């Protein structure tokens, strides 16, 4: 039996370090007309817009490359006891995964 | 205290320093009473040398 402490040390999330400016690949799980819901393995799902080039090949299950900036967008405003989360993540598209 | 008195003789209408001069005297007066009730021999020498 492996202790839970050892699992966190070798987990990919811990090895990433700060979430800012990290190249993380993700898989698309939902498609809208212009919005691509991408799961990059984090707690929440980032949303990006379909690029104008090679946009027809962005389908469900396709793998893409992302640049994580904030793992979970969250800010504090005056008069709020608890921060108001957005239930999403911030990322940008660098293209499609090079298989 | 000597420095404030020299300042007071020039600037007579100054009130911030006049309060400081009075408070400085009171603190020295309080401390002299404390010294007298603990070490009389030193208090007598301090009183004579400084002219207080």
């Amino acid at each position: 039996v492996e202790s839970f402490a050892s699992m966190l040390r070798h987990s990919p999330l811990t090895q990433m370090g700060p979430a800012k400016n990290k190249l993380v690949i993700g898989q698309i799980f939902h498609i809208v007309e212009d919005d691509l819901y991408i799961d990059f393995g984090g707690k929440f799902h980032c949303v990006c817009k379909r690029p104008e080039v090679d946009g027809e090949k962005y389908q469900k299950g396709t793998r893409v490359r992302l640049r994580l900036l904030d793992l979970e967008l969250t800010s504090r405003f005056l008069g709020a006891t608890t921060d108001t989360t957005i239930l999403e993540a911030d990322a940008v598209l660098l293209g499609l995964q090079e298989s | 205290i000597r420095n404030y008195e020299e300042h007071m003789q020039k600037h007579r209408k100054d009130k911030a320093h006049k309060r400081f001069l009075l408070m400085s005297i009171d603190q020295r007066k309080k401390m002299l009473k404390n010294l007298r009730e603990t070490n009389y021999a030193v208090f007598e020498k301090i009183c004579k040398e400084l002219g207080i």
């Binding site: 202790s3 040390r9 370090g17 | -």
Partner: protein
């Protein structure tokens, strides 16, 4: 006996605090060019923190340095000196739209 527990150490990823434009630099009332860049050329007003962007220490020093030059006779009061009108722009205010 478990060596996998986290240790009580400070954050190693603490990015250095941002430096202002004039940090570690000595402002003066004799160099008009340095003082003139923070003055509106059309009116002669002094920009605030939200426009100048300087920190809390060099903003006051610039204000005192500028006013010393106003009276001592080193820079105009109601307008920016035209000789230093082509200096690089450091403020974040735009008049032309």
């Amino acid at each position: 006996s478990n060596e996998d527990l986290p240790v009580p150490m400070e954050n190693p990823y603490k990015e250095p605090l941002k430096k202002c434009i004039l940090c570690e630099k000595h402002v003066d009332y004799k160099n008009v060019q340095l003082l003139s860049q923070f003055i509106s050329p059309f009116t002669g007003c002094i920009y605030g923190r939200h426009i100048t962007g300087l920190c809390g220490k060099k903003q006051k020093e610039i204000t005192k340095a500028i006013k010393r030059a106003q009276i001592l006779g080193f820079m105009p009061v109601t307008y920016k000196d035209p000789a230093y009108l082509k200096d690089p722009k450091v403020c974040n205010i735009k008049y032309r739209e």
